[PDB]
Design a protein around this ligand. Structure first.
Ligand SMILES: [Mg+2]
Lengths: 320, 424
């Protein structure tokens, strides 16, 4: 089965590809989050032979193994349950399919854009078969403050600190766009107690995991008190959210705004009709993106006033 | 993404690559005609144009050509020329699209009865590819989607020929089931092999002499080029039927093709006073929404984006194209340039803004003359440096430039620009 919890303070992951700057960012993030240990246990790359790579766990220097063969990495690091796949697009499909032969991997982030849709349908099919959650393709990934950050998600430490992504808040969110997810980090940190977990499902026609997949996880995560979805013209994904609320499956406050209202350049698929349907279903929908932060704030304050959210105490972050 | 191909491209690929025992007729019998066509050499190249009567029609991604009377049927090479005089180069309107009819396909006329027309379509969904058949095809097919037999070929499944015969073809004439079934099997292998996502033949004609593909519409998954290049060759992806692309759009397209970054530009109203240059695909939709929400739809000049970590030079080339486009005619109320964006994860905002700054400096003269005011809001790696150099180029050039950071709600600058709220 697909897991409800994908990441935690103890997550260890394998990164496939040659991406030193990305790994160092994750470790820097791991450090300001006051994790006990680095979140990247090893790397995989068939284009080179085994070896080690140098990174910094705070001021302390450490070594991260790089394996030529995925098996060696899996075998030597069975504590790993996540793979971040930076494979270039000629390698993304085979490598992702191979990863799924190793059952310790419960979550795969696929970074590459440009994977043919027919290939992605096959990845989805196997993933669903194995109970593996896929985030992407064509995504920067996502972020769980205090716990784990996928690759470049959240940019530089400057942004991690400004948006307080180094410690959990009560607000979870999902969107297609990695650019807008970082904006959501910002909007949410200025209007609430901060992001609990954020996922960018990517822009491909068939994403490995959908808005509803994550909304379900969030609904089932006690730490999440409040859910933000940034929806979009095209397809009928957001109706699953209407049905979910009506059938009693979804009960937490959901804020949603679907972009693409200005499609004046099927009727039920427009942002306008989806916004309206969501609003009628009980979703908190702003009158425009311009008012999204306002509605998030209003829904938050009401959760505070009635005890559902207890804003924790700010604790400055480690060295940096 | 999936992209439409011309009927001629689709037919060529089909004639070249379909593997079927079912005899397909008139392979490669088609001639393309434009307003530049040399009719002497066209005939010397397609001598078959004289052997029999013809059918001529536009091949520009227009649907329902028959029902809308855009097809000359059963004509001589002369009757085709005569049919084309009034039309070639002339405007036509279909739905709410208006454009010039400038690309035509001539093929042999195939005499056949109504009962020899059929419907086939294949198209992709998340759960696999649906194969459609109806035993009545052509113009009067009607609501084919509600009527056709449908068979889902699941992800990584095989299309079983007995399913074709026993489910899809249940209503087909019994003496045509074997040939139709052979054709569909081959059609699906071709669809899968050349990474199609949509392939419709309406009508498919089957006579005593074999199978004729009279009408074809198709899309392929363009990202599959690294796989299908050996088979596709230099495949072209036409725009929808409508206006022709402006030279600047074509330029930005060529820029796009030469980068991993996404460089997009479409002109809605080249005379509008409201111009955007947004980083982020999501952000660009949001800014467009906001402008329309605040009443500016008729002054919205363009939509598009420069996304995915473009270099300074690419960003310079993109920006100077917009700067040029907005200094062609003065507007009585001056103009607005919205340089907005979400907060980048990896894009070096300092490098991109350096390119934008170089552009503003190169067009500073006309920018003051056209009374352009610039609003800037951006976040991302090194964004503070980027915002600084944007403010600098403002003071330096005398062009009014208001810069904002992540403290300013992303769309707030749109209200400021339009005078719906004050500039802080
Ligand atoms: Mg490109």
């Amino acid at each position: 089965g697909k897991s409800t919890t994908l990441f935690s303070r103890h997550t260890k992951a394998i990164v496939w590809g040659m991406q030193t700057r990305a790994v160092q960012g994750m470790l820097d993030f791991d450090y300001v989050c006051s994790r006990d240990e680095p979140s990247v246990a090893a790397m995989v790359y068939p284009f080179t032979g085994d070896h080690k790579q140098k990174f910094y766990w705070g001021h302390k220097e450490i070594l991260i193994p790089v394996f030529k063969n995925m098996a060696d990495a899996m075998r030597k690091h069975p504590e790993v349950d996540v793979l971040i796949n930076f494979a270039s697009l000629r390698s993304a499909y085979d490598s992702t399919m191979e990863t799924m032969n190793y059952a310790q991997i419960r979550t795969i982030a696929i970074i590459a854009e440009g994977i043919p849709e027919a290939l992605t349908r096959k990845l989805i099919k196997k993933a669903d078969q194995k109970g593996v959650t896929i985030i992407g393709p064509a995504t920067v990934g996502g972020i769980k403050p205090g716990c784990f950050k996928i690759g470049n998600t959240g940019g530089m430490l400057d942004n991690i600190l400004a948006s307080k992504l180094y410690r959990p808040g009560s607000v979870a969110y999902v969107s297609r766009s990695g650019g807008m997810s970082n904006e959501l980090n910002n909007i949410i940190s200025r209007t609430t107690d901060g992001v609990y977990e954020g996922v960018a499902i990517g822009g491909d026609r068939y994403p490995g995991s959908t808005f509803m997949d994550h909304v379900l996880r969030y609904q089932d995560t006690p730490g999440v008190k409040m859910i933000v979805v940034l929806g979009e013209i095209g397809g009928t994904e957001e109706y699953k959210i209407c049905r979910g609320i009506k059938e009693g499956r979804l009960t937490k406050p959901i804020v949603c705004w679907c972009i693409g209202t200005c499609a004046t350049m099927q009727a039920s698929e427009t942002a306008v009709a989806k916004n309206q349907a969501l609003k009628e279903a009980g979703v908190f929908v702003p009158r425009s993106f311009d008012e999204l932060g306002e509605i998030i704030q209003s829904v938050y304050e009401d959760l505070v006033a009635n005890g559902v959210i207890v804003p924790a105490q700010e604790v400055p972050p480690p060295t940096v | 993404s999936a992209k439409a191909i011309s009927e001629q491209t689709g037919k060529e690929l089909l004639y070249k690559f379909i593997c079927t025992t079912s005899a397909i007729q008139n392979r490669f019998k088609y001639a393309r005609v434009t307003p530049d066509t040399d009719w002497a050499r066209l005939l010397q190249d397609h001598p078959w144009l004289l052997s029999q009567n013809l059918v001529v029609k536009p091949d520009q991604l227009i649907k329902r050509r028959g029902k809308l009377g855009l097809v000359g049927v059963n004509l001589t090479l002369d009757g085709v020329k005569s049919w084309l005089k009034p039309r070639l180069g002339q405007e036509a309107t279909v739905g709410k699209a208006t454009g010039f009819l400038k690309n035509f396909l001539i093929e042999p006329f195939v005499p056949h009865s109504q009962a020899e027309e059929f419907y086939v379509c294949i198209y992709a969904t998340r759960e696999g590819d649906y194969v459609l058949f109806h035993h009545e095809g052509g113009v009067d097919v009607g609501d084919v989607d509600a009527k056709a037999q449908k068979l889902l070929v699941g992800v990584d499944e095989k299309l079983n020929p007995e399913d074709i015969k026993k489910h899809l073809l249940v209503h087909a004439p019994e003496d045509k089931k074997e040939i139709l079934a052979s054709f569909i099997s081959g059609l699906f292998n071709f669809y899968e092999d050349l990474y199609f996502t949509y392939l419709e033949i309406n009508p498919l004609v089957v006579t005593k002499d074999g199978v004729y593909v009279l009408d074809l519409a198709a899309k392929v998954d363009a990202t599959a080029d690294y796989i299908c290049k050996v088979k596709w060759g230099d495949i072209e992806f036409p725009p929808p039927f409508g206006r022709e692309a402006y030279p600047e759009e074509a330029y930005i397209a060529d820029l796009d093709a030469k980068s991993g970054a996404s460089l997009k530009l479409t002109l809605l109203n080249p005379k509008g006073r409201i111009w955007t240059m947004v980083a982020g695909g999501g952000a660009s939709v949001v800014y467009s929404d906001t402008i329309c929400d605040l009443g500016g739809v008729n002054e919205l000049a363009n939509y598009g984006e420069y996304s995915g970590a473009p270099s300074e030079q690419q960003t310079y080339d993109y920006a100077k194209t917009i700067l040029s486009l907005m200094t062609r005619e003065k507007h009585p109320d001056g103009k607005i340039l919205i340089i907005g964006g979400s907060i980048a994860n990896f894009t070096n905002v300092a490098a991109t803004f350096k390119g934008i700054v170089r552009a503003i400096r190169d067009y500073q003269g006309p920018l003051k003359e056209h009374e352009v005011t610039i609003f800037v809001r951006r976040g991302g790696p090194n964004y503070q440096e980027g915002l600084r150099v944007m403010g600098e180029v403002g003071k330096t050039t005398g062009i009014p430039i208001h810069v904002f950071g992540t403290e300013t709600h992303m769309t707030a600058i749109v209200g400021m620009a339009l005078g719906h709220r004050p500039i802080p």
